[PDB]
Design a protein around this ligand. Structure first.
Ligand SMILES: [Mg+2]
Ligand SMILES: [Zn+2]
Ligand SMILES: [Zn+2]
Ligand SMILES: [Zn+2]
Ligand SMILES: [Zn+2]
Ligand SMILES: [Zn+2]
Ligand SMILES: [Zn+2]
Lengths: 48, 351, 137, 44, 142, 114, 127, 88, 65, 138, 56, 100
RNA sequence: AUCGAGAG
DNA sequence: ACTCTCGATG
């Protein structure tokens, strides 16, 4: 939500209420610079 | 890239926002800020033990940085701290604070209505913090009289950067009030246990951002920190020495002013705190506000390498999924290819 | 020549159709300080000056300028100026390089004093641009 | 090196530590002379 | 050979506009970065990079190319490695490398430390928030 | 800036041969020949002179891109007739016609005034 | 540029050689024809600089070549430049054998008229 | 009678170099006589740099109203003369 | 600037025809069309090349440097 | 536009003095009920009183401006159906030149004041290089 | 970049001259003519991401 | 507009709005574009010389003071009354390196 | 940093 | 409340 319109005040009221960020949002992983759960990253690859 | 670390590489899964407790602020800090003087001290290219300490981060392309070394390319920012002569208001919380003082009477520190009330049972039933606080604030700000401590709760209104009372509230007073709200009352209005408390909204001591936040080519944030420090030392000077009544209050409101405008400069208050060049100065709030802000301008979209741009033209002899790329651009942009037995010859030719 | 593009006769282009001259001026000036500290116009050597430019200075003369007629290209140095801020490496570089993407020939060099008595220079470089694929008409 | 005036036909050779102005003129506008090392042109 | 349709043919006053390709053409493969955000500088004359705008990001999301989006936002631009305390989850960590001395004054942490890869602009954001009395605590577990 | 040299329109590059004969894999007894540093001036003429030979089934030239001075000529002949001989006969016919045209124009010019 | 477009004598051009073929350094007398141009403002009036002012310098050794074509009535030829009172133009031209496919300055002809079947009896054109 | 047309060009004025320089010079000159009043009450030494640097500044930056960023005339009152074409 | 040496379109030499054009204009008091016709400029591309041209060098020669 | 000019601005005081000395009543001596059909006179947005028989005054002022006694830049507006008279000497007014059509032609109808003789004099001044635009304006 | 077709993966054909040459029938999704229009081009830096471009 | 500003407006600005209590201001005199060099010599400035040397094409204001003085320099619009190029002929402009 | 002009 | 390209002035 801070990545749109009211940026700073959102961070303020989020810091006041001590909110928990799931980090499964797109723009959140964009900010963190991680591979977002989008299409290709909507799963995990392992070895059997 | 950078270098090898013994620590395991992990991924940020959760982000727990919260407030900065002055205790944790001064515990985290690695340098106290006593001198407003930036770097040069009596014709000396160094750093005085005040602002911009070499402990916060060296700035001369050296090989040392607060004993941790690692130059200035690897080492991030090491936060400092500055203690204010008197507690001041955090601007971005001015509203919220003013709301809390209306949900809890003065001196005591208790909610006006409990489970004894009919509507308060319904208001406290909501699990959502914001909705609960919004539901309680509307059903608690009408209460004038009052657990005991029966006192006529004053009508509080906003004025500049202070608060008044009708039967002028001090910041130290409101600090003392929020310090006594305890834990059980925090859950009833959104706040958290160890992360965010109303006794941390007001600024006792404020953290000092390292040079990688306010570089020098001096930065506006450095000037504003110099203003805060100046107001602080001036206040302390007018406190420890001859202390008039109608003279130190102006200094308190001055420190309050500089601190409040250090973060947010676009306020309802017309004084926008200009600089020496006549510039309105760049506050931390302005650094983040889009579209040229940090979030929307450097995170949601940022300039990238391995890219090109040119005038386009049509070509009837190109396939649909093809793109004509000028030779110069082809020589400029590059692709990293690992040497394998399949392509070692071709790569050898390319090299 | 589809989608607002056009085909131009290359032969006529060779005969000077839509050719143009392009002049560009680079201006520099010697600074002055309260205690008589002055930047100088010269051709600094690698050992006598800090930083320096990645381009070559071999086209400069004794006065730190280019003689009009010399073809410049890439990141050549047009104006050589040094600011002094015994000790090795006694000067900082303040040279003016030719535009990284441009090239051409030094058309004319102007050396004049300022209103405050500051020696400053305007160097005009000239290039002939010929209508190429991508040019707007 | 040498320089030529702007609004009159002259041929000053005043190097550094001289600069402005001109010889029997009065104006400070000074242009620089053409190089001796000739440049070729592809007549195209 | 003759053409079937005849052609409208005659003199017409055309003017040469000043938008020429060699003044427009641009290409960069790793160049000079800015100082504040450590991102590619703005401008063709300064040999800078092109902004991978918000709309571009939206297009890459619509396509589903997540790894590409991550590449543009890390390896292509600013990619930084920071250390996080396993307690408060802030960048308080005094990571004395080459000695493995991962200190943390305020939590007394010397063994429970972490290392993450984030954009330098995100680090700047987090720091600016920390300088604004806000703690963007970063945990690495669900 | 990125424009190619002019002589690359008629001067052969490094290792580039004038003709490249390739066995056409489509139809049997066919061939595709790559002419380097040549344009329609030669292609159209040779192709048109190949269609005069009635022992030639297919004959067509094309310039895959105007940027580059080169063109491909595909030739298909009847069995028992090597296409190279068709190309050679076509060429010699062209040369003969041109020679006759030169002689004729000369004799016609020698009869003029002013 | 306009020097390049000047029509030079190319009669015995076939017994001249391409500079790219000759085993010399840069250019010589077997491949190139060098002609100088020295003009200076003399009179108060505008001093014109024509193509006749070009002077063959290199050794032609018999070959009819290099001489600038003058079909002008007055006998001046192509107007190259115009000089004022004290304006000087001194340069040296090196002429080489070239194909008009490389530059239109080597174009031996101008406009070639070409028309077949003036009655559209072949019907190659729908009027 | 219907409402007044607020887009009527007749009830609009164009201020050229004259009025602009008039306002600017009035401000700078009043500032000058103010400073001269100060030098007078302190007790021929008249700071002429005020008018000069003021005019030059306003003409160079295009920011009409000396060095005060509160000016709404920040939209470039004076611009660089476009000399790409005579018609331009 | 100065009269283009050769016509853009075809390639005919029209550099030697400027002064003669001016003479046919002012000395013989002809119109532009007939003057252009007498100079062997039949195609309208070369005809254009001379008719359309504006001799600017005469104004450039007005400077002393 | 090509011929548009901006009003330099002149002094309205002589026009005021001319008005008051040509049968114009002061505003402080105006009695509406005994003169309802009196055209009120405005100068630069200032009501200086009213005036009866406005036609004569208007033709007078017009004649003066066309002669030159009143600055040609000054605009004069006669509003009949609103019974108003607005004279503007304001600076910044964008104006444009126009041919004057007057039916003073005896042997004819409504014709232009400018004639081919004037044009001949203009072209004479052009070919010679004493009869310029100002001569037309005056 | 209004919709996803504003960014599409192409094959490179290195050519002379300083213009981005594209096919006519790709003009529509990009919504572009050639009256001075400029376009941008990004280059992948690993096998997986170029796989993303080519396969998606 | 500029000429109107110089010949009329300026005098109004100086006279009608300024008087100290005394030192009353008088007539305003506007010179031709000059330059006070670092050489100390004040001399006539021509537009070409002004553009070449990054100078300001301005004239000096002078006011008569009662109970003469230089109060500053006003930038002069080219081809105005206080400009050398107004009373200049074509040949003069060609000699002044200014395009006619 | 801000301002001004321009490109689709 | 889209990407660019320059120019100015602190
Ligand atoms: Mg377009
Ligand atoms: Zn450190
Ligand atoms: Zn109580
Ligand atoms: Zn001289
Ligand atoms: Zn910690
Ligand atoms: Zn040779
Ligand atoms: Zn022609």
């Amino acid at each position: 939500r801070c990545s749109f319109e009211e940026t700073v005040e959102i961070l303020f009221e989020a810091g006041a209420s001590a909110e928990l960020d799931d980090c499964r949002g797109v723009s959140e992983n964009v900010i963190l610079g991680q591979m977002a759960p989008i299409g290709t990253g909507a799963f995990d690859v392992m070895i059997d | 890239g950078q270098q090898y670390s013994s620590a395991p590489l992990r991924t940020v899964k959760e982000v727990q926002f919260g407030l900065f407790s002055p205790e944790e602020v001064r515990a985290i800090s690695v340098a106290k800020i006593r001198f407003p003087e930036t770097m040069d001290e009596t014709q000396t290219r160094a750093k005085i033990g005040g602002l911009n300490d070499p402990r916060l981060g060296s700035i001369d392309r050296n090989l040392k940085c607060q004993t941790c070394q690692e130059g200035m390319n690897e080492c991030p920012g090491h936060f400092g701290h500055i203690d204010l002569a008197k507690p001041v208001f955090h601007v971005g919380f001015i509203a919220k604070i003013k709301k809390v003082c209306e949900c809890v009477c003065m001196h005591c520190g208790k909610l006006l209505l409990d489970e004894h009330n009919e509507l308060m049972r319904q208001a406290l039933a909501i699990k959502d913090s914001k909705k609960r606080f919004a539901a309680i604030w509307t059903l608690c700000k009408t209460k004038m009289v009052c657990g005991g401590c029966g006192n006529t709760q004053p009508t509080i209104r906003k004025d500049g950067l202070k608060l008044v009372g009708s039967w002028v509230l001090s910041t130290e007073e409101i600090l003392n009030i929020f310090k006594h709200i305890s834990v059980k009352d925090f859950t009833s209005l959104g706040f958290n246990e160890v992360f965010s408390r109303p006794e941390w909204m007001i600024l006792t001591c404020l953290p000092v951002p390292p040079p990688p936040v306010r570089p020098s080519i001096e930065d506006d944030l450095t000037f504003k920190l110099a203003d805060i420090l100046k107001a602080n030392i001036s206040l302390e000077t007018l406190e420890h020495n001859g202390a008039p009544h109608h003279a130190i209050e102006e200094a308190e409101s001055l420190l309050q002013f500089h601190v409040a405008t250090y973060m947010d400069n676009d306020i309802a208050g017309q004084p926008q705190a200009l600089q020496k060049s006549g510039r309105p100065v760049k506050s931390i709030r302005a650094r983040l506000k889009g579209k040229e802000g940090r979030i929307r301008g450097n995170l949601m979209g940022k300039r990238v390498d391995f890219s090109a741009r040119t005038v386009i033209s049509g070509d009837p002899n190109l396939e649909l999924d093809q793109v004509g790329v000028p030779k110069s651009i082809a020589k400029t942009l590059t692709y990293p290819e690992v040497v394998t037995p399949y392509n070692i010859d071709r790569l050898t030719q390319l090299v | 020549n589809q989608e607002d593009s056009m085909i131009m006769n290359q032969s006529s282009i060779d005969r000077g159709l839509f050719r143009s001259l392009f002049f560009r001026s680079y201006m520099d000036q010697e600074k002055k300080y309260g205690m008589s500290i002055t930047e100088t116009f010269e051709k600094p050597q690698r050992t006598n000056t800090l930083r320096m430019k990645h381009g070559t200075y071999d086209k400069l003369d004794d006065d730190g300028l280019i003689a009009p007629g010399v073809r410049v290209s890439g990141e050549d140095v047009i104006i050589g100026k040094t600011t002094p801020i015994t000790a090795y490496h006694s000067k900082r570089d303040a040279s003016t390089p030719l535009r990284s993407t441009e090239n051409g020939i030094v058309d004319q060099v102007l050396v004049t004093t300022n209103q405050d008595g500051l020696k400053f220079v305007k160097v005009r470089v000239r290039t002939t641009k010929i209508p190429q694929i991508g040019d707007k008409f | 090196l040498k320089y030529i005036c702007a609004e009159c036909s002259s041929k000053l050779s005043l190097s550094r530590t001289d600069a402005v102005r001109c010889k029997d003129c009065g104006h400070r506008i000074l242009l620089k002379a053409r190089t001796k090392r000739l440049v070729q042109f592809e007549a195209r | 050979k003759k053409l079937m349709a005849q052609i409208f043919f005659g003199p017409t006053y055309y003017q040469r506009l000043r938008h020429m390709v060699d003044d427009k053409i641009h290409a960069r493969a790793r160049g000079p970065m800015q100082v504040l955000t450590r991102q590619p500088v703005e401008g063709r004359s300064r040999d800078g990079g092109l902004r991978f705008g918000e709309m571009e990001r939206d297009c890459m999301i619509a396509h589903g190319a997540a790894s590409f989006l991550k590449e543009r936002l890390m390896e292509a631009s600013d990619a930084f490695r920071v250390h996080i305390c396993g307690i408060c989850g802030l960048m308080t960590v005094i990571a004395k490398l080459n000695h493995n001395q991962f200190e943390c004054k305020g939590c007394d942490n010397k063994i429970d430390i972490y290392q993450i890869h984030i954009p330098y602009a995100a680090k700047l954001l987090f720091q600016e928030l920390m300088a604004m009395n806000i703690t963007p605590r970063l945990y690495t577990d669900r | 800036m990125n424009a190619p040299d002019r002589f690359e329109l008629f001067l052969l590059g490094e290792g580039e041969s004038k003709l490249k004969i390739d066995p056409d894999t489509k139809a049997p007894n066919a061939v595709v020949i790559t002419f380097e540093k040549e344009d329609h001036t030669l292609g159209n003429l040779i192709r048109a002179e190949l269609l005069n030979d009635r022992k030639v089934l297919f004959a067509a030239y094309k310039v895959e891109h105007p940027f580059f001075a080169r063109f491909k000529l595909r030739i298909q002949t009847t069995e028992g007739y090597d296409p190279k001989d068709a190309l050679k006969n076509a060429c010699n016919s062209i040369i003969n016609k041109l020679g006759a045209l030169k002689t004729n124009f000369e004799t016609e010019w020698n009869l003029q005034t002013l | 540029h306009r020097l390049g477009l000047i029509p030079l004598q190319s009669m015995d051009i076939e017994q001249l050689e391409y500079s790219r073929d000759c085993f010399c350094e840069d250019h010589c007398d077997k491949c190139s024809v060098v002609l100088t141009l020295q003009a200076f403002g003399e009179s108060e009036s505008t001093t014109n600089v024509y193509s006749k002012d070009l002077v063959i310098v290199s050794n032609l050794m018999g070959r009819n070549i290099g001489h600038p074509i003058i079909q002008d009535k007055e006998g001046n030829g192509v107007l190259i430049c115009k000089l004022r009172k004290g304006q000087e133009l001194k340069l040296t031209c090196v002429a080489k054998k070239g194909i008009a496919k490389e530059h239109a300055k080597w174009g031996p002809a101008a406009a070639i008229e070409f028309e077949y079947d003036p009655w559209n009896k072949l019907k190659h054109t729908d009027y | 009678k219907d409402q007044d047309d607020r887009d009527h060009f007749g009830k609009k004025r164009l201020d050229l170099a004259g009025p602009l320089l008039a306002q600017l010079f009035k401000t700078l000159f009043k500032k000058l006589t103010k400073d001269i009043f100060r030098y007078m009450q302190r007790t021929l030494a008249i700071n002429a740099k005020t008018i000069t640097s003021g005019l030059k500044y306003a003409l160079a930056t295009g920011n009409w109203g000396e060095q005060k960023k509160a000016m709404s005339s920040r939209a470039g009152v004076s611009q660089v003369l476009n000399r790409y074409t005579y018609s331009s | 600037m100065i009269v283009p040496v050769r016509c853009f379109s075809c390639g005919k030499v029209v550099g030697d025809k400027w002064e003669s054009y001016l003479n046919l204009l002012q000395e013989d008091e002809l119109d532009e069309g007939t003057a252009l016709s007498r100079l062997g400029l039949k195609r309208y591309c070369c005809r254009r090349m001379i008719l359309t041209h504006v001799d600017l060098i005469e104004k450039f020669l007005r400077y002393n440097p | 536009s090509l011929m548009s000019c901006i009003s330099v601005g002149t002094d309205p005081m002589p026009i005021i003095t001319f008005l008051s000395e040509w049968g114009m009543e002061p505003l402080e001596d105006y009695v509406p009920h005994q003169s309802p059909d009196a055209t009120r006179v405005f100068v630069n947005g200032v009501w200086h009183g009213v005036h009866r028989n406005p036609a004569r005054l208007m033709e007078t002022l017009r004649t003066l401006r066309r002669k030159g006694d009143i600055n040609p830049e000054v605009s004069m507006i006669r509003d009949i159906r609103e019974k108003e008279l607005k004279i503007f000497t304001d600076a910044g007014r964008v104006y444009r030149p126009l041919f004057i059509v007057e039916d003073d032609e005896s042997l004819g109808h409504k014709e232009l004041k400018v004639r081919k003789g004037h044009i001949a004099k203009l072209m004479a001044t052009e070919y010679q290089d004493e009869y310029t635009w100002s001569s037309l304006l005056n | 970049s209004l919709h996803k077709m504003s960014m599409m993966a192409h094959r490179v054909k290195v050519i002379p001259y300083s213009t981005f040459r594209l096919n006519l029938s790709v003009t529509s999704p990009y919504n572009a003519d050639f009256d001075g229009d400029e376009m941008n081009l990004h280059v992948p830096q690993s096998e997986e991401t170029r796989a993303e471009l080519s396969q998606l | 507009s500029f000429n109107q500003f110089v010949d009329y407006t300026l005098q109004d600005i100086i006279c009608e709005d300024s008087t100290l209590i005394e030192i009353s201001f008088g007539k305003i005199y506007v010179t031709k574009p000059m330059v006070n060099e670092s050489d100390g010599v004040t001399h006539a400035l021509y537009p070409q010389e002004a553009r070449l040397r990054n100078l300001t094409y301005s004239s000096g204001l002078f006011v008569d003071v009662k109970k003469k003085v230089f109060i500053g320099r006003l930038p002069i619009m080219l081809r105005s009354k206080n400009c050398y190029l107004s009373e200049a002929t074509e040949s003069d402009l060609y000699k002044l390196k200014e395009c006619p």
